[PDB]
Design a protein around this nucleic acid. Sequence first.
RNA 1: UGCCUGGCGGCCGUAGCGCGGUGGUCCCACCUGACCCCAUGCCGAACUCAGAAGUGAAACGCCGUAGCGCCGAUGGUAGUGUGGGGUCUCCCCAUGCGAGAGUAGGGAACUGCCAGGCAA
RNA 2: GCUCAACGGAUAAAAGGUACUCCGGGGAUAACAGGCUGAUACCGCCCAAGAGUUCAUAUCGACGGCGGUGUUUGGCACCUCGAUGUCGGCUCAUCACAUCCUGGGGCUGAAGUAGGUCCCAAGGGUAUGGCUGUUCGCCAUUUAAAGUGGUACGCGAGCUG
RNA 3: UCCUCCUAAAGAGUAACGGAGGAGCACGAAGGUUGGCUAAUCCUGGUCGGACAUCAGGAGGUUAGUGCAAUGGCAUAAGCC
RNA 4: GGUUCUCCCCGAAAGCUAUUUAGGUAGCGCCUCGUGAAUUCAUCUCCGGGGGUAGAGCACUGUUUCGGCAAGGGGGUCAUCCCGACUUACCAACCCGAUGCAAACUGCGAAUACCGGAGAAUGUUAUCACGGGAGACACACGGCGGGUGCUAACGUCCGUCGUGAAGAGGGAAACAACCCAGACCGCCAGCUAAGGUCCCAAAGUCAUGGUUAAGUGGGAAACGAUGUGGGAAGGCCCAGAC
Lengths: 58, 65, 94, 75, 136
Amino acid sequence: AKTIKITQTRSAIGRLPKHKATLLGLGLRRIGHTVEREDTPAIRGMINAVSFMVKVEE
Amino acid sequence: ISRHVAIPDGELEITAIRAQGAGGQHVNKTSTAIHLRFDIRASSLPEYYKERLLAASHHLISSDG
Amino acid sequence: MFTINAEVRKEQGKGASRRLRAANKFPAIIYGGKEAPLAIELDHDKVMNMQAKAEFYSEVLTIVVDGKEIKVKAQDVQRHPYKPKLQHIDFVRA
Amino acid sequence: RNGRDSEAKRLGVKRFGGESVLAGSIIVRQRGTKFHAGANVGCGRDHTLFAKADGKVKFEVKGPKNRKFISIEAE
Amino acid sequence: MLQPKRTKFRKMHKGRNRGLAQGTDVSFGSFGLKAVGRGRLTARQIEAARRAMTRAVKRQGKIWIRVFPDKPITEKPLAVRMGKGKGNVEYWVALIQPGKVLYEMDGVPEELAREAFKLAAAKLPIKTTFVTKTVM
RNA sequence: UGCCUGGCGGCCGUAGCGCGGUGGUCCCACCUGACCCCAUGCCGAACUCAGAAGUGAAACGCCGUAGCGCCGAUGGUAGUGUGGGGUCUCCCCAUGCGAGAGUAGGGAACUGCCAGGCAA
RNA sequence: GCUCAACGGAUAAAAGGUACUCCGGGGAUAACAGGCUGAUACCGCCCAAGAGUUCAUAUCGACGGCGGUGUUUGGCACCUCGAUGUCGGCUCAUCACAUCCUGGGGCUGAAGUAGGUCCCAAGGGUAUGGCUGUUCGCCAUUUAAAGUGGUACGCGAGCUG
RNA sequence: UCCUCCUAAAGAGUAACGGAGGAGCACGAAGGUUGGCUAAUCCUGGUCGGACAUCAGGAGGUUAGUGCAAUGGCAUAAGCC
RNA sequence: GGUUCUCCCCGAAAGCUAUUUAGGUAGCGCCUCGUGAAUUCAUCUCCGGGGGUAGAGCACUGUUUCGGCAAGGGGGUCAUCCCGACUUACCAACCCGAUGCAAACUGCGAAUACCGGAGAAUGUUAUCACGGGAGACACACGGCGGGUGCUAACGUCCGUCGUGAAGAGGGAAACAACCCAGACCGCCAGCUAAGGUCCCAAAGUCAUGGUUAAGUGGGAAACGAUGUGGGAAGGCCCAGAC
């Protein structure tokens, strides 16, 4: 449950609804978004799918 | 007795020229598919018959064969 | 009678297997009995010529991993389809 | 020169294993009888295995010939 | 050509051609002609090489054609419109994957066996390679 | 209880088959007769009754046997979700998932309830 | 009580012709042409038994294969159906080279003369008539040769019909 | 128009003038229930009987059969009497 | 075919079914508005599930090659009319071992996808029911899995996702559909994406180590060749090799 910052690098336009909804599940809205969450396989699993377009900041 | 039509592929020159007659504008633009043959006497091979096919007069075959 | 030096692996899967196959190395596996199957990585170039000798498939080896020498026997081989090269060799720990 | 067909008759499992069904709930809609009726599961004229009691579903494989059975535990 | 006697069907799908080959090993002979590429060997092609291969060795030795076409692929009669069902079966092709050994030979010394396959390679469309058997 | 047999379940080819040996107070099968209950689209074989001298070949159980079937790693390979790339009729790279086949090896069961037997 | 099988059945009903045709629309959908492809056609090449007195490669080359060009016939309908006049001849041509002649060379199963084949080369030249509407083609006779194709298979706001 | 398999990319579903075959019924019994039975094809011997007649034994094993097209399924038989 | 003033907000489809229907229409799916409702709904972790496709395999439905074996029909010395002695150089299955193929084969079997439950976080409730009003039902292309086609097409027909359709801006010279990326407005402000940094044209004639002689880069195959670099191995080798 450690505080962890999540960065949005790329834009989600040519992605699947499964990957687009994952961003909605993490609150990532626009390019250059830094939101602080917590760690657990449920949360990190979301980052695990679209780690190509998001940057992690532990 | 044993009859199978040969007619050698790669030995017969087929010439596609336009047609003749009536039938509209269709008959004079894309009627080039009509066929005209070209079977030279040099592709004989029986040695005796082809010259007997040339000497005796008939149409479809000119004075040269 | 084969001086086949080898190193114990640390990454044993699909992705890491080919990264060393591009670096002139191929994995093997020494197994036999109650002991644990030791993941072995060896240099490809050498054994590519060692199996030219016919008695290589019927005699004991002098394979050494980390100083200690293990006596084994060649079990079977999975070669590459069209390129005449080795991929993975099954070793029965004798 | 044949070109004929048939509109598919919707087979399969409508209520999967692990869900609590009601009495008379169709569990598996099967053309053949691959699945065989277990506890509180009935077999119709089209061998469609449906529910009898109320509860969750268990896809228990039993029998010497290992045919697949479905039963319903009171849950 | 080599036509399979009494097939179950007449015409089928063209399928897809990808994947490696099974017969990587060399059995029943001493040397073989493994296929590197991945292409379509028609019946007339396979027939052509095998006839021309025994011509080189001069009747000594035996041949093992470890394949068979058995896949009918059609063709439409020229100048016909795309439709009205499948055309008639024209030839027989076998899908050759990378690593498939085509012809084999034993009872013949290496060098003469070497040129026979080399002259059998020029009849084929796909890129091949030479292969030697090995014990285990 | 060490073992026995018979019945009924769980697990349901590691559990099952072929071969060789072997068991009978008890149990089971075979076996005796079948004018009576019943039975054969002919027939006491199957079916059933009344007995059971005799036997342990058969059947079944048990032990050995892998002579067969079966079970099946570790590793590698095929394939592949997702994000990129190339020479893009097919493949490569990062990463997650990960066979089938085959090898070593295991392996000719285990367990519960009940009823009397056995030396209690 | 309906093969109301055009089977959610319009209602038994009902065959056709239109080049005498007319009207409303469409390149959603055809003919010519252009575009994409290159199955076919044409051209080049790989391999090679055999023919060639001897000899595979002087000259051809089966059995099979790999490519190119976009000229034949086609596949697809992407453009035009509130218009793109379509064959051939006349006239005027222009370009490409896979070259018919002239020129420069290799080889030859090139003795000489005369030829076969291949490479380089597009500057110039590259028939008159009979027959048919014909392109094509056949023929008579010349010529150093009477090349092959692109150019809406050039050219009808230039002509003939 | 309806039915089965495949295409259909492991839920369902999914088109083509795509690939293969059938239906426009049958039956008072082939339906229901009870009890019994459960093979096909080969090897061997035996009256005519030999390629397959019937019976007997054995191997084998559900490749049988199921009023029919195909698929799935079936002996705890939905198979046979 | 045409349909005239303005601003703001949300925002499609070109699919299924039926149609004397296929350029039309109706219902549903999708859209909008109003209203009422359940932590209702989506992503992820875990758990509980059946599927049989890719692949693979070859007992089964068929199919294929080779080897060992093998009765029967026949050829023959013959019965020299059947029977019958023998061989089988012959067609040579049935069976055993070994080798492959399959949309319409399965003694096996994923990844994803899909259904149900539980838990956290996020999302102006994105889920569903009811009522008004619609439009639309001719889609295109690219990636992937496929049929047809010639494993041709800017071809045609389906599943699925993105995009265009109804999205400009930057790049691919130009270029809807390719890549990056979602325009409320103003600024002579800065930092990055794909792509690039000699000049045309904004940015390094950047740093280090190698490579090519062809202007390769800047269209392409089978095939041929002492082009040439790198790596490994083998033959002979100052009892002197080429």
